From Swiss-Prot:
Stated family: Belongs to the universal ribosomal protein uS2 family.
GO CC annotations, alphabetized: cytosolic small ribosomal subunit
Source organism, top-level taxon: Bacteria
Protein's name according to its UniProt entry: Small ribosomal subunit protein uS2
Molecular function per GO: structural constituent of ribosome
Gene Ontology biological process terms from the UniProt entry: translation
The entry's keywords: Ribonucleoprotein, Ribosomal protein
Length: 228
RNA sequence: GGCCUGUGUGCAGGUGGUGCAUGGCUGUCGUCAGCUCGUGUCGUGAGAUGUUGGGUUAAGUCCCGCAACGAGCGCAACCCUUGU
């Protein structure tokens, strides 16, 4: 099953990898040809793995599951956040707090405090406290809001995790593999293929490629959720 | 029965000993800013992380970074006096 054409991936800059000094040697089965110090990824393998990943995510969300959108690099932050908000899944955009999946019982209390803070703001009580403590509450609210945005709606813990640039986000993929959750990720030439259960070859550093692939998986989630 | 006088019987009474058996109270490092815990992670383990780095402060005071996220006893505040 395919959604985006080989030519769309070609002019989207999806086959451009990193240099020949940083490649993970396990990606010799993805890398297709070397041209001018850039490793070029195999598009046929890309679409075979895209078929596999699409089937997996569709099955998961059609059974009633959640897909975590994880992105920290500036190229993927805005795109991932926008598409996750538009479809209705939890997302991570700014920074991954260590121990959010494997330690949810603790970080969920921070979400409870976010509920409490927003609820006490909605009551409108401002001048009933110290005018310094109110400011401290406001920056505390800003911190929690900028830290936890999709996990705010997430609650009942994820079913699969979709991550961009595994190499940057090693903490998330490690926690997911520790919990036994399958990992869906985009892989550049410097990302280990063995630590991703459902890999999609791709370029992580380009905003065009990031947006295209992550919106592909968002569309998959949308169709599967509609299939519920 | 209240009451003491007696003879005894228990017994009282010990500023007698051990602060190297103790409780309680107090000095001291020092009113110095530090000391820890929960869950998570790393290590076979003792343990480490957090509490490290940059900046700032009277201060582990606070901000920004970070496999950590929080919390407690401390700092500050609430109390009295003095200045309008």
């Amino acid at each position: 099953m395919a959604v985006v054409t080989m030519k769309q991936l070609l002019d989207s800059g999806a086959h451009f990898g990193h240099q020949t000094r940083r490649w993970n040697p396990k990606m010799k089965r993805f890398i297709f040809t070397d041209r001018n110090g850039i490793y070029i990824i195999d598009l046929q393998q890309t679409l075979t793995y895209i078929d596999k990943a699409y089937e997996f995510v569709k099955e998961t969300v059609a059974h009633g599951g959640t897909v975590l959108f994880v992105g920290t690099k500036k190229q993927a932050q805005e795109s991932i956040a926008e598409e996750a908000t538009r479809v209705g899944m939890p997302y991570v955009n700014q920074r991954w707090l260590g121990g959010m999946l494997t330690n949810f019982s603790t970080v969920h209390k921070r979400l409870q405090r976010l509920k409490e803070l927003e609820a006490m703001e909605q009551t409108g009580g401002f001048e009933g406290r110290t005018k310094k403590e109110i400011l401290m509450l406001t920056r505390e609210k800003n911190k929690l809001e900028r830290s936890l945005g999709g996990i705010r709606d997430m609650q009942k813990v994820p079913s699969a995790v979709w991550v961009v640039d595994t190499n940057k986000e090693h903490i998330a993929v490690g926690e997911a593999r520790k919990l036994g959750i399958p990992v869906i990720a985009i892989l550049d030439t410097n990302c280990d293929p063995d630590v991703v259960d459902y890999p999609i070859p791709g370029n992580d550093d380009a905003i065009r490629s990031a947006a295209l692939l992550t919106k592909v998986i968002a569309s998959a989630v949308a169709e599967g959720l509609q299939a519920r």
